[PDB]
Design an enzyme around this catalytic site. Sequence first.
Site, mmCIF file in Angstrom:
data_model
loop_
_atom_site.group_PDB
_atom_site.id
_atom_site.type_symbol
_atom_site.label_atom_id
_atom_site.label_comp_id
_atom_site.label_asym_id
_atom_site.label_seq_id
_atom_site.Cartn_x
_atom_site.Cartn_y
_atom_site.Cartn_z
ATOM 1 N N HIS A 41 -4.973 -0.254 -9.570
ATOM 2 C CA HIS A 41 -3.796 -1.018 -8.508
ATOM 3 C C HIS A 41 -4.080 -0.822 -7.140
ATOM 4 O O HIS A 41 -3.594 -1.349 -6.467
ATOM 5 C CB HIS A 41 -2.510 -0.763 -9.262
ATOM 6 C CG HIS A 41 -1.886 0.389 -8.945
ATOM 7 N ND1 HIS A 41 -1.113 1.174 -9.792
ATOM 8 C CD2 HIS A 41 -1.385 0.638 -7.537
ATOM 9 C CE1 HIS A 41 -0.732 2.084 -9.054
ATOM 10 N NE2 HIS A 41 -0.818 1.709 -8.028
ATOM 11 N N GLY A 143 2.798 6.326 -2.138
ATOM 12 C CA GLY A 143 1.408 6.848 -1.733
ATOM 13 C C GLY A 143 1.056 7.982 -2.581
ATOM 14 O O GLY A 143 -0.163 8.554 -2.518
ATOM 15 N N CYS A 145 0.466 7.654 -5.889
ATOM 16 C CA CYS A 145 -0.462 7.254 -7.144
ATOM 17 C C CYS A 145 -1.831 7.743 -6.687
ATOM 18 O O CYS A 145 -2.378 8.089 -5.895
ATOM 19 C CB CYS A 145 -0.235 5.820 -7.144
ATOM 20 S SG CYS A 145 1.185 5.129 -7.538
#
EC number: 3.4.19.12
Lengths: 304, 304
Positions: A41, A143, A145
């Site tokens: 993603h 942020g 991830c």
Amino acid sequence: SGFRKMAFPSGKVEGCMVQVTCGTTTLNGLWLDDVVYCPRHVICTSEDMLNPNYEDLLIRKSNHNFLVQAGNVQLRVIGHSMQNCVLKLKVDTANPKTPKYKFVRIQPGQTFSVLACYNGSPSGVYQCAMRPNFTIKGSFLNGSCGSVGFNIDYDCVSFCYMHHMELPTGVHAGTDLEGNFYGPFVDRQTAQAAGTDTTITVNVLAWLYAAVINGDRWFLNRFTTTLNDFNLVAMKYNYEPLTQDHVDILGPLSAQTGIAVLDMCASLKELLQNGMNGRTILGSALLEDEFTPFDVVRQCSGVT
Amino acid sequence: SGFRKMAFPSGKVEGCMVQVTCGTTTLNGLWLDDVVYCPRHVICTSEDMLNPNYEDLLIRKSNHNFLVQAGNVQLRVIGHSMQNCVLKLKVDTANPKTPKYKFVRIQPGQTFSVLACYNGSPSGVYQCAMRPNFTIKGSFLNGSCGSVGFNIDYDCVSFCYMHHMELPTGVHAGTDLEGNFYGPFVDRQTAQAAGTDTTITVNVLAWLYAAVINGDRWFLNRFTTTLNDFNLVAMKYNYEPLTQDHVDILGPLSAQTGIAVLDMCASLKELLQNGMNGRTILGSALLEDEFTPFDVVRQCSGVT
Ligand SMILES: COC(=O)c1cccc(NS(C)(=O)=O)c1
Ligand SMILES: COC(=O)c1cccc(NS(C)(=O)=O)c1
């Protein structure tokens, strides 16, 4: 003495964290050998996230669209592929700090350390468990991830988790390092409800053993039970069923303390039925279920 | 979202840990530049520990009596001195991994990370607070002495604690990195009782702010109070008095949540008087006092 919620030392993993940017999306990657692993993603606008077609979004991306920064130095991307829900970015440089490592898919109930990162930079470390509903209860802002979860067996880092998603309820979902989600979750901004967050019974028992080892004994009762009797009570209290495999795993804690596993089950049963009555165990007013039997052995024996 | 008991990343400190052996006593040292810091009781037999005269025991020791090992390589000791309750061993090699660092003496209520070590080898990391009675509630087995407590401000490690003692009650005592004990404790195997372990009020308030920020709001009440009224209740419940300095420190959490500090004091007051009624806050059934206001700001803003 003393018993603390303890994370693995983070140094070996700190040395693997990089920043991955695709367009206007920045998150964290894991640099092992000449491959950077990150959530796929990274390629999405928040708009994309509502109904992403990852194969179709990826056609628009080349090696040079993936900006990988390790500290304040750019890595050259010479290849990229999608494996399940992760991107593998081939870089021209092996991570000089690559530790011995394995990729392991953990079972519900297993604990691991999370190195929370923002912009490829570590902010903190904490101890988690894979919940029985395949969520984790983390601490993850925008942020974070691509932050990873890991165990260390002496010198070998076993990577078990990469962070992907916060559910509308503020619990967390992510993948193993082959990009496969834990549980039924998907990397899409859609209604995804978690199942029942049941208590990890074998973990509570381990922690009750830890409590006995550290002088907290007030809850030890005069009763014993059977697996079937205990499990009737467990069900009623949304505790996971206890198996003979769990009893076997607890065997060394039984041996050390001379408290039969089924006796500690009967002590747990009374604690469920009677409550704590405002008392604490190891400084907690609830039954802690994020220590595995091995975690208790490790912390109570001083493994490095 | 989510709020976890979070330790600093341990890598910078992992790189400073060595094994110190004097005779048959092995514990941990901290290698910064060309100096190894360790507890002076490294020189003691357990027999010595009952009534040690450290100056007299030290006369029997030379540079070559101190065996310093960093990984599996011996460091050459070219000098040694006693500063308060620590030994400073001058070695012929600067630690190549020395981070930017400061020595800081913390106040009661301040939190820090502990890297638990055995034989100069890190086993885990956990978050502590200096208790108001100048103990800490750690996890420390035999061999863990010389494990250190630290804060990180971006790239600079502030060393605030070195582990020395377990009290007969299984709580922990140690020194700053100038060898000065926190509280009235001494490196002698004698009866040393801790004072009242009071609750760090300003820390509970911070964590209540963290709870509001993360969606746990059920305890927010319709009341406000004054410092004097709140403090009458605090005293009764063995909570530290709240000062205007504490109110000032909480100001940014007040601003973010729009909950006046004294309103949250009145919510805390009701929680003390009424209990939790079997409810949880941020997954705890007691009021957590080992997050500072800054810890809450840090974790809720994602500082690295
Ligand atoms: C020493 O006995 C144990 O606790 C043990 C033994 C073998 C394996 C494990 N791993 S676990 C806690 O995840 O299920 C623990
Ligand atoms: C941002 O306001 C704060 O929380 C703050 C401000 C200044 C200093 C601190 N340090 S502390 C929590 O140890 O007392 C916190």
